[PDB]
Amino acid sequence: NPNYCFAGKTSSISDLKEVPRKNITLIRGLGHGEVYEGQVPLQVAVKTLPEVYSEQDELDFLMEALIISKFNHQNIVRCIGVSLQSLPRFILLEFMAGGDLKSFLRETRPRPSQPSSLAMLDLLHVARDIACGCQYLEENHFIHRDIAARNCLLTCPGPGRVAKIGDFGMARDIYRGGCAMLPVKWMPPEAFMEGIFTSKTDTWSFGVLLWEIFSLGYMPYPSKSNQEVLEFVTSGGRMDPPKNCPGPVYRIMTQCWQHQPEDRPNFAIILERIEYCTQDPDVINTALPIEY
Numbered sequence: 163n164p165n166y167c168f169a170g171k172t173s174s175i176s177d178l179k180e181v182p183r184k185n186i187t188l189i190r191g192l193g194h195g196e197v198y199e200g201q202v203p204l205q206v207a208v209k210t211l212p213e214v215y216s217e218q219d220e221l222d223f224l225m226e227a228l229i230i231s232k233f234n235h236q237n238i239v240r241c242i243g244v245s246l247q248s249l250p251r252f253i254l255l256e257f258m259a260g261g262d263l264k265s266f267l268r269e270t271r272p273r274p275s276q277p278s279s280l281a282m283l284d285l286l287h288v289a290r291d292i293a294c295g296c297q298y299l300e301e302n303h304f305i306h307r308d309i310a311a312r313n314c315l316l317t318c319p320g321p322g323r324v325a326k327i328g329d330f331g332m333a334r335d336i337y338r339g340g341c342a343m344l345p346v347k348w349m350p351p352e353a354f355m356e357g358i359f360t361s362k363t364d365t366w367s368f369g370v371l372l373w374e375i376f377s378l379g380y381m382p383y384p385s386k387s388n389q390e391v392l393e394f395v396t397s398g399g400r401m402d403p404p405k406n407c408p409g410p411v412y413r414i415m416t417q418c419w420q421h422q423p424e425d426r427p428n429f430a431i432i433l434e435r436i437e438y439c440t441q442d443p444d445v446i447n448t449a450l451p452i453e454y
């Protein structure tokens with residue numbers, strides 16, 4: 163069985179906390195592999211490996227458990243344990259009742275009925291949360307490679323929500339595929355052109371996540387295909403501000419999207435700038451667009 167090295171420690175599948183299958187109860191589907199709300203009474207999310215999957219699938223599923231289990235940070239989802247000695251194989255994760263960030267932004271957009279559902283400060287707190295997660299990965303020399311709203315989760319729908327990075331399947335694949343499946347809209351030039359990935363790769367992607375957040379869940383580069391985005395970005399093209407986006411927030415995006423990786427901020431600097439935004443009354447008093 164494969165080994166995994168994070169920080170100074172090497173780990174194996176034998177290190178994963180096996181939870182007896184008999185102690186695990188499935189409650190409901192969550193939006194499926196498949197994913198369930200479960201009970202161990204500890205509430206968990208159950209990520210399953212379909213039995214119809216091959217050998218590489220098994221290994222990838224396994225490696226992802228190892229990866230998540232070795233992190234220790236508040237803005238990265240916890241792994242409760244695994245159930246690998248029965249089929250289908252289970253990974254048990256911290257249950258995030260707020261669901262994924264992209265769906266949340268789209269479903270929670272301010273409306274005529276819910277004009278006050280979300281405010282600028284809520285978006286800034288989500289951004290800060292994920293940036294704090296990205297900073298922890300950066301300082302531990304881990305490159306995520308797929309920072310995006312679809313891969314972030316929320317503890318709850320309501321005001322006390324915490325955002326966390328919840329999927330590590332791309333870092334798992336490159337750790338050990340298709341072109342039309344690559345998240346090119348989240349990738350910097352050196353990444354999609356040279357296959358070069360650094361901490362500054364995640365900075366660019368975080369800039370796109372910021373745009374996702376402040377657009378309230380729109381697909382990046384509206385109406386452009388992957389190949390068109392590739393040519394656009396390579397030529398110096400960048401997204402416009404999301405509707406009603408404060409200039410200080412758009413400025414963080416455009417800094418994350420600098421062409422040269424060395425010119426882009428590390429996450430410590432990103433966090434500082436996000437914090438300054440939350441301090442500025444003109445930023446947080448800005449009204450979000452209410453779609454009719």
Ligand SMILES: C[C@H]1Oc2cc(cnc2N)-c2c(nn(C)c2C#N)CN(C)C(=O)c2ccc(F)cc21
Binds near residue numbers: 260313315
């Ligand atoms: C592996 C999975 O994890 C969880 C999913 C959910 C909650 N808590 C955890 N741990 C969840 C979702 N939607 N809803 C309504 C709930 C609930 N409650 C999203 N979902 C179906 C996913 O597959 C998914 C998407 C992105 C990501 F980063 C991790 C996951």
